[PDB]
Design a protein around this ligand. Structure first.
Ligand SMILES: Nc1nc2c(ncn2[C@@H]2O[C@H](COP(=O)(O)OP(=O)(O)OP(O)(O)=S)[C@@H](O)[C@H]2O)c(=O)[nH]1
Ligand SMILES: [Mg+2]
Lengths: 170, 122, 325, 766
């Protein structure tokens, strides 16, 4: 068994909390409670190896909000989440990635980008292509997920675990 | 001291004792400050609460270098404090110690006069 | 960052904490480091938006600080502009009284941007939609800058498009039947100058004509000639014929924080107390306390201060068995 | 801020030089620069400056070059725990260090592990969580299949985290005891020894935490069962790994358990180990030319009830051909003997262990450990060693050069310190009994040549058996005469040899007057030698050697001799000439610090007062501090030539403090004034009023200078001025209270709480 923390970052009002509950409970409820700081846990299996995941949903951040140092000490894995239905979320996730790297220099660290609210195809204002382009601009791994498509959330968290494993192997 | 100064007075008496102990170091080292250190001791004692249990410790710490006769009046106050604290026997002991003679064994004999202040206190 | 997260959570109840927060808060904006004043202004805007109209007694000090820190720096300019946006949303009519104290600042911003940071004007212009009826007595001050922005060749195209959109949004909230109708003439030159931008120009013209009503219909022929030369049509032309709730106390980590099993030395016990006081805040059910956890972590005396309240918040959620443990 | 950037530019370029010495010099240069030159600026701009600093760090750590990475790691290590535990430091430092551990080179390996230890030791708010990560990571790296490099990483990180900060590590004690024994059986020796070292540190932690435990622990017992499993033949049938490796692991585990259970037998080991490391340090210096003691009650009980088992296991593994197991046994057997010697005597374990260890001295690679065991066993058993006394003594004699030194002259051979330390503990065991034996052994040890181990054991033999003490001096003194003057003691050469000769000459006590012959010589050649180390050492020794001569002037006034007085006087003049005229500042500082009050009688003379006055205006500040301290002390001796000079000086510091606007000069002037005040009360007492006025207006200045040194040193000077003038300040004390309280209540003012409170207390007392 390997204990892994993950930190979920991004703009406010994007479904970081929704993704966390979807992955850890399989449900999705629209209350919109601004999450100051939340922690969830599971004991899952990836590639036949048991990972005890501890997910830390951070409060939404803006381009002016300072990056707390708590999520730079013992995180070993990051999920940068943005809403595909908000260009502001995309710009702010760019800013948040910049501030995170600044908090760790520019050291290589497992980071993966998530296009959230994919089901809202009508309201989409970020397509797949530019999200990818940003991801391999960061050398990160791209995915798209929604709080109504639990398979995608499981894919997201499995992917960040795999990225952490790959970075560890190097 | 996180609750009230009243509780912290027990430890503040210890602080007083330790600082006076450093002043005993200075008193032994520097003969020129002996009168000044004596006056500082007197004033600080006057500032303390008039409890025999603490005056005893403070004067006992002071006794390292200064005998009662060298600070007569100070001990007289202690005697007075013991006189009105349900410890009259200790007050008599202090006063006979300061006089050097015990009139309690010489009732017919008139009292000493070489030190009139202590005679008055006794 | 903590105070905001409290004011956001409580809602209008947060007004009860105004007289404590603001007099210090504004003062800190006056004496804080330059690197932090931008963040403090942004959080001031957020707090003002949450408070809505109950920010009147502090609005004079707020605008004073705004005036004496609205230097021509792009970052602070943008943050302050956001703060005016949020103040306009919060107050509206009352903010009229405080409008005249900011007009010279707006004008200097308009005529003193010399970089791609010219985008700041757009953000300032992005505030002008939200003004509406409170711009009546000062519309004629703010008009000639936008008049210049219509036909400015030096200004970037998106800035001019933004200016057209701004006057468009102003159209349905202000009485343009007065002298302001003269803005018809500027956009005409824009139609005959910039081809890529004609669409927003004609949308703006349609909205202005709709606001004006009969008073414009007399002067149609010049605009009709422009349209015929450009051959771009619109429907309106033909119409000219006529709280935050509680939070789940994570029980596992809560009794885990009370892990006095292998704590022996004095240093061990002090560390246990520190970790427990922090974990109580982290697992506190009330968002107000949990907002203080980040600050408590980097400042232990805060954790010591709220240990009792944090324990009360954590304890009231547990059931009989968890309480017994 | 062009300077603030360019300085880091040249620091980075220097740290990128492939020379180890250049990188290290740049490392301490950067350490100095950030330590005592970038504290004039506050904490928030310190965090801002750390961004540029860490950018420059990672510019070194970014490259894959081993040397560039090593230089970056040196920068990180020097920068960890040097300033306050600021915010931006720890996250970047942790993330930088986490990449280094999987590396292969043990150098960067240990460097990164120690860096993690110091970072956790930094004592910031994020250390706790940080520790819980690293330990977990380390433990996670022990559960891997083999994962060699990461296993060594976990081992070293756990070791350095355990010693560095125990409080946070103890919460991971149970997983550590569950996982470390996986790495103890690793088939590589380095991982094994490191893992046993991490177990050592954790066991020490458990030992501090033991006596106050409510109930006895189980970690010691579990460790013993793990060792037993290691020695079990049936459980040793695991494939793919060597039996001897399991034997070594079990032996190391048992060694550590015994050590934490046998501190009394470990103290002598530690002292002898310090002597051996002194020998190694001397050897390293010559090459470069060209702790806490605790006993676990529960572990002691466990080994008391399982002593025969461990002894039988060790004596069964005695016959192993592998060298590592042989050395571990040689280290363990004396520890067992020191644990419960009575069982050694009664159970007759002496024969096998003694025959084995006397067989080991013949072996080449075990010879050092062989003498280790001989020396420790001699003191372990003080009665049954008599039967073996000749059998070891002849081995020491054979190891040392033979009696015929001139005929059979050694070509090139160094006697390892373990032989000398074995002699020392052998004397400790049966000192008076073997007095003649050590007397005979004395000559070849002197014939070996000067070594730190030799001098240490000669000192020990002198203290243990004073009867022949005078011999040890009379020989060694002659040896010194053969290396300093290159002549027999009558009544070029290696820099390190002369350095150690000076060390022992100044340190080892002698009664014969012949030391005076050295003194003048040390003041004639060595002080004038072009080697800075020889000059420094000559100055030191010449300072130490004159105290008996000055005692006649001070204590035994009836025996004052003009010969000794003149020798002291002209040697002192030569020392002052050395300490003034030498451009090197370190020699000046050492020389001036080496003049105590003893020499004041000869320093009161105008000739030496002139040299001291010259030092009193030295370019370097610390030398100035010693100079002013000395002159203030001498003011009581020769007021004529000092009091006017110190009055002019006092005027100079007052002028500099009142006029100079730069913070550093203000701080230096405040320190100078404080030293003058503490050292010359008679001078300052009449001039207390203007000095106090100047200091007060320096405290109440409307413009607070960025640095805190000025206000701190002004407060310290005010405090010791109060100490000088008792009641003269009584009528300027209330304003001082107002000022001191005002700066105490609010921490925005640069004044520090420590010195403010000290000044308040000194004012009250005075
Ligand atoms: N339709 C749709 N709504 C979604 C989706 N993901 C999230 N939401 C909705 O968006 C809202 C906000 O998401 P949430 O998870 O609460 O944001 P957050 O970032 O955690 O909350 P904050 O503390 O950071 S402000 C929720 O009410 C949720 O129902 C999605 O994929 N589709
Ligand atoms: Mg949220």
């Amino acid at each position: 068994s390997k204990s892994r923390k993950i930190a979920i970052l991004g703009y406010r009002s994007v479904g970081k909390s929704s993704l966390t509950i979807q992955f850890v409970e399989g449900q999705f409820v629209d209350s919109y409670d601004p999450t100051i700081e939340n922690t969830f846990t599971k004991l899952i299996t990836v590639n036949g190896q048991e990972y005890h995941l501890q997910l830390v949903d951070t409060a939404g951040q803006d381009e002016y909000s300072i990056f707390p140092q708590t999520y730079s000490i013992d995180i070993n894995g990051y999920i940068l989440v943005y809403s595909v239905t908000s260009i502001k979320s995309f710009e702010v996730i760019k800013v948040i990635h910049g501030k995170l790297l600044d908090m760790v220099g520019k050291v290589q660290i497992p980071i993966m980008l998530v296009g959230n609210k994919k089901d809202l195809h009508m309201e989409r204002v970020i397509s797949y292509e530019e999200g990818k382009a940003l991801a391999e601009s960061w050398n990160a791994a791209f995915l798209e997920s929604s709080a109504k498509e639990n398979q995608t959330a499981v894919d997201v968290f499995r992917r960040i675990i795999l990225e952490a494993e790959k970075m560890d192997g190097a | 001291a996180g609750e009230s100064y009243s509780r912290a007075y027990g430890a503040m008496v210890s602080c007083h004792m330790l600082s006076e102990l450093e002043e005993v170091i200075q008193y032994k080292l520097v003969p020129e400050r002996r009168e000044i250190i004596r006056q500082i001791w007197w004033e600080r004692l006057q500032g303390c609460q008039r409890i025999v249990e603490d005056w005893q410790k403070i004067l006992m710490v002071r006794s390292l270098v200064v005998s009662p006769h060298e600070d007569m009046r100070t001990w007289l106050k202690y005697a007075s404090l013991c006189g009105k604290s349900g410890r009259l026997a200790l007050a008599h002991k202090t006063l006979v110690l300061l006089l050097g003679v015990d009139p309690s064994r010489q009732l017919d004999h008139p009292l000493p006069t070489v030190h009139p202040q202590v005679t008055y206190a006794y | 960052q903590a105070i905001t997260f409290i004011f956001k959570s409580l809602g209008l109840k947060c007004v009860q904490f105004l007289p404590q927060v603001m007099p210090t808060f504004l003062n800190v904006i006056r004496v804080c480091d330059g690197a932090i004043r931008e963040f403090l202004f942004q959080q001031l805007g957020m707090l003002v938006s949450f408070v809505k109209s109950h920010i009147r007694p502090y609005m004079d000090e707020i605008v004073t600080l705004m005036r004496e820190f609205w230097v021509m720096n792009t970052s602070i300019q943008s943050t302050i502009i956001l703060l005016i946006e949020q103040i306009v949303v919060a107050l509206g009519g009352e903010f009229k009284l405080y409008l005249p104290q900011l007009i010279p600042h707006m004008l200097r911003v308009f005529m003193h941007d010399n970089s791609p940071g010219r985008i700041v004007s757009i953000k300032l212009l992005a505030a002008i939609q939200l003004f509406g009826a409170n711009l009546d007595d000062y519309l004629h001050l703010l008009l000639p800058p936008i008049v210049k922005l219509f036909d400015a060749p030096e200004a970037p195209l998106p800035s001019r498009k933004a200016a057209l959109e701004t006057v468009d949004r102003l159209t349905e909230s202000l009485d343009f039947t007065d002298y302001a109708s003269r803005i018809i003439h500027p956009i005409v030159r824009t139609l005959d100058q910039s081809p890529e931008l004609r669409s927003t120009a004609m949308d703006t013209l349609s909205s202005l004509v709709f606001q004006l009503g009969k008073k414009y219909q007399i002067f149609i022929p010049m605009v009709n000639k422009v349209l015929v030369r450009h051959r771009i049509n619109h429907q309106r032309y033909d119409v000219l014929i006529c709280p935050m709730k509680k939070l789940h106390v994570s029980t596992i980590n809560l009794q885990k924080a009370w892990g006095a099993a292998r704590r022996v030395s004095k240093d061990d016990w002090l560390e246990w107390l520190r970790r427990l006081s922090l974990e109580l805040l982290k697992d506190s059910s009330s968002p107000s306390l949990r907002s203080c956890w980040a600050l408590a972590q980097a400042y232990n005396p805060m954790a010591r201060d709220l240990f009792n309240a944090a324990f009360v918040s954590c304890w009231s959620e547990l059931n009989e068995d968890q309480q017994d443990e | 801020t062009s300077s603030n950037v360019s300085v880091l530019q040249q620091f980075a370029s220097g740290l990128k030089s492939r020379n180890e010495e250049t990188r290290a010099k740049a490392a301490k240069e950067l350490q100095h620069y950030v330590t005592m030159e970038l504290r004039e600026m506050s904490q928030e701009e310190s965090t801002r400056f750390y961004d540029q600093l860490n950018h420059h760090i990672f510019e070194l750590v970014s490259s894959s070059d081993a040397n560039e990475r090593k230089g970056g790691i040196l920068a990180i290590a020097s920068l960890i725990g040097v300033e306050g535990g600021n915010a931006t430091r720890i996250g970047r430092f942790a993330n930088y260090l986490r990449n280094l551990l999987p590396s292969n080179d043990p150098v960067v390996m240990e460097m990164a592990s120690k860096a993690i230890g110091r970072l956790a030791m930094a004592g910031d708010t994020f250390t706790a969580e940080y520790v819980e990560f690293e330990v977990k990571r380390a433990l996670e790296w022990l559960g891997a299949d083999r994962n060699e490099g990461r296993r060594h990483a976990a081992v070293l990180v756990l070791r350095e985290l355990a010693i560095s900060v125990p409080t946070f590590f103890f919460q991971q004690v149970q997983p550590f005891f569950d996982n470390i024994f996986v790495a103890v059986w690793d088939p590589k020796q380095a991982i094994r020894e490191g893992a046993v070292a991490a177990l050592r540190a954790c066991l020490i932690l458990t030992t501090q935490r033991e006596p106050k435990e409510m109930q006895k622990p189980q970690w010691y017992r579990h460790t013993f069962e793990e060792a037993e499993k290691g020695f079990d033949e049936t459980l040793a049938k695991e494939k793919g790994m060597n039996r001897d490796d399991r034997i070594h692991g079990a032996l190391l585990i048992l060694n550590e358990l015994v050590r934490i259970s046998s501190m009394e037998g470990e103290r002598l080991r530690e002292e002898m180990e310090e002597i051996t490391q002194q020998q190694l340090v001397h050897d390293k210096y010559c090459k470069d030319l060209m702790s806490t003691l605790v006993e676990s009650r529960c572990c002691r009980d466990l080994m008391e009830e399982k002593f025969d088992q461990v002894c039988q296991w060790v004596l069964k593994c005695r016959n192993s051909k592998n060298s590592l197991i042989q050395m571990t046994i040689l280290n363990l057997l004396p520890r067992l003997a020191a644990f419960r010697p009575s069982a050694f005597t009664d159970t007759q374990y002496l024969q096998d262990t003694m025959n084995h260890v006397l067989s080991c001295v013949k072996k080449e690679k075990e010879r050092t450990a062989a003498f280790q065991a001989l020396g420790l066993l001699s003191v372990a058993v003080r009665s049954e060693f008599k039967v073996y006394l000749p059998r070891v003594l002849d081995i020491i004699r054979a190891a040392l050069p033979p009696k015929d030194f001139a005929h059979k002259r050694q070509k090139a051979m160094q006697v390892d310190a373990t032989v000398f330390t074995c002699i020392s503990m052998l004397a400790r065991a049966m000192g008076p009994g073997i007095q003649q034996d050590i007397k005979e052994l004395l000559e070849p040890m002197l014939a070996v040549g000067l070594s730190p181990a030799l001098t240490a054991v000669l000192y020990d033999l002198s203290r243990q058996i004073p009867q022949l003490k005078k011999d040890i001096q009379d020989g060694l003194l002659k040896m010194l005469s053969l290396v300093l003057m290159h002549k027999p003691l009558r009544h070029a050469s290696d820099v390190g040899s002369i350095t150690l000769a000076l060390r022992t000459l100044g340190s080892f006590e002698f009664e014969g007057h012949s030391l005076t012959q050295f003194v003048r010589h040390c003041a004639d050649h060595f002080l004038n030698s072009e080697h800075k180390e020889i000059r420094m050492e000559a100055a030191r020794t010449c300072s130490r050697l004159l105290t008996p001569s000055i005692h006649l002037i001070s204590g035994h006034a009836h025996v004052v001799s003009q010969t000794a007085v003149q020798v002291v006087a002209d040697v002192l003049s030569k020392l002052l000439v050395v300490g003034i005229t030498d451009p090197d500042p370190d020699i000046r500082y050492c020389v001036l610090a080496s003049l105590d009050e003893r020499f004041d009688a000869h320093l009161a003379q105008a000739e030496n007062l002139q040299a001291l006055f010259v030092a009193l205006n030295d370019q370097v500040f610390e030398i100035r501090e010693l100079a002013i301290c000395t002159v203030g002390r001498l003011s009581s001796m020769n007021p004529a030539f000092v009091m006017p000079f110190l009055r002019k000086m006092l005027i100079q510091i007052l002028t500099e403090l009142e006029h100079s606007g730069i913070g550093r000069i203000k701080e230096q002037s405040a320190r100078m004034l404080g030293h003058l005040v503490s050292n010359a009360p008679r001078l300052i007492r009449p001039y207390m009023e203007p000095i106090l006025k100047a200091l007060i207006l320096k405290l109440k200045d409307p413009d607070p200078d960025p640095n805190p040194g000025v206000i701190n040193n002004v407060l310290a000077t005010i405090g010791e001025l109060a100490q000088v003038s008792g009641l003269e300040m009584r009528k300027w004390v209330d304003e001082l209270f107002i000022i001191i309280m005002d700066m105490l209540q609010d921490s925005s003012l640069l004044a520090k709480r420590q010195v403010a409170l000290w000044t308040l207390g000194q004012l009250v007392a005075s």
